[PDB]
Structure formats: structure tokens, C-alpha cells
Amino acid sequence: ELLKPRTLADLIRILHELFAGDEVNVEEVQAVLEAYESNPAEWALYAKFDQYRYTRNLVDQGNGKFNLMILCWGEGHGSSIHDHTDSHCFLKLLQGNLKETLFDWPDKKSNEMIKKSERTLRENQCAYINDSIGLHRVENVSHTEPAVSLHLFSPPFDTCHAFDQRTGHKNKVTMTFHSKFGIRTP
Ligand SMILES: [Cl-]
Ligand SMILES: [Fe+3]
């Protein structure tokens, strides 16, 4: 029975219930993420920015079932085109706006990766992707507003691929945490 999360802590408690088993009800998880109304005071601890690129800030390890993290995007910061390592990805906006550009998996032949579509994800909205759907790039294209997003990855993963938009060629990337549980982790 899905109830509205009252706070980030309540959300986390509900997520531990939704991931208690071995499968994932994507629509329920997305609905509860969307229903949490972002409260900046509740997540300020995790919102640690870097001047030069976006940061990944671990919030909860989901009793091993998921990584819940907060990504902090300075003005003009964005990601590579990337996959999600056979995991679910839920992305909820906590502050600002992000542009999500979708791409299909490349063919073996070296070719330009052409976007399928793009959209603007707005405060409190929750997007979903997995490798069966395709690849994406996420960007804060704002010149004046930092963005903050809440990401849930299940199962957790520490590597993925970045794709060269010019060729479709992929390279393995190891993701690093800027902080864990509010503590800077150099
Ligand atoms: Cl992502
Ligand atoms: Fe992603």
C-alpha cells in the first residue's frame, strides 16, 4: 500500500519496503518518488557541489538492493551519453531543471549517434530508464540555476559505459562518490 512520503527519511523507509523482495515494481517506485515533495532542508547535507563537474553523493545503500544518491549539477554541467549496467534508473528532480536526451544503442558500425528525443525534466518530476529502453545524456543547461536530482539505481552498480556521440564507441567508466552519508569522501 503506497502512501505519500512525508519527508526524505520517510521516502527511504518506503523504498526499503518496495525493494524488500527480488523484483521491482517500476510504476510503484516511480509513483512514490514523484509523490515526495522536495524539501531542501531535508537534503542539504547531501547537496555538495563541485565547481567543475557534477557530483554524486550517496544517501542510502538500500540494504544492498539499491544505491540512492543525490547528484548536484552546476550551471552547464552534464553527463556523458551512458547506460545503466543492466540496472533500473529512477531520476527525480529535487531542484532546477535537467535536459534528458535519449539515444538508441549504437550498431557495430562507427556512426554518429542521433538523438531520438529530448525533454526537460522539471522540479519534482521522476523519469525512468533502463538498458532495454536505451541510453541517455542528462544536462543542466541553465546558466543561472544549479540543479539537484535524486537517483535510485537497482541493483547498485559502480561502473557503466560512456558513449562517444561521434562514433557510438563505448568506454568503461568507474563512478566515484563525492560524499557518502554527508561525509566528503576524497
Ligand atoms: Cl543517471
Ligand atoms: Fe543515467
User: What one-letter code names the amino acid at 53?
Assistant: R
- Give the method used: X-ray
The sign of the dihedral angle between the CA atoms of 84, 34, 100, 55 is negative
**Cα 68 to Cα 90: distance, rounded to the nearest angstrom:** 9
Cα within 13 Å of Cα(166), Cβ side: 0
Cα 41 to middle of ligand 1, angstroms: 23
In order of 87, 134, 137, the CA distances from 116 in angstroms are 21, 10, 11
Cα 151 to middle of ligand 1, angstroms: 7
Contact (Cβ atoms closer than 8 angstroms) between residue 90 and residue 31: no
Dihedral (Cα; 35, 37, 43, 44), 10-degree rounding: 160
Burial of 15 (0-12, 13-18, 19+ CB in 10 A): buried
**Cα 48 to Cα 183: distance, rounded to the nearest angstrom:** 10
H/E stretch holding 156: none
Ligand closest to Cα of 103 equals: 2
The sign of the dihedral angle between the CA atoms of 101, 105, 108, 114 is negative
**Is 136 annotated as contributing to ligand binding?**
yes
Cα 69 to middle of ligand 1, angstroms: 10
Cα 3 to middle of ligand 2, angstroms: 27
Cα 89 to middle of ligand 1, angstroms: 6
85-120 burial string, b = 16+ CB within 10 Å, else e?
A: bebbbbbbbbbbbbbbbbbeebeeeeeebeeeeeee
Query: Residue 100's closest CA among 72, 68, 128?
Result: 128
E strands present in 49-169: 55-60, 67-73, 81-82, 88-95, 98-103, 117-121, 126-129, 135-139, 147-154, 159-163
Domains and CATH numbers, the chain: 1-186 (2.60.120.10)
**Is 82 annotated as contributing to ligand binding?**
yes
Helices (H) and strands (E) in the chain, counts: 3, 13
Enumerate the β-bridge partners of residue 151: 69, 91
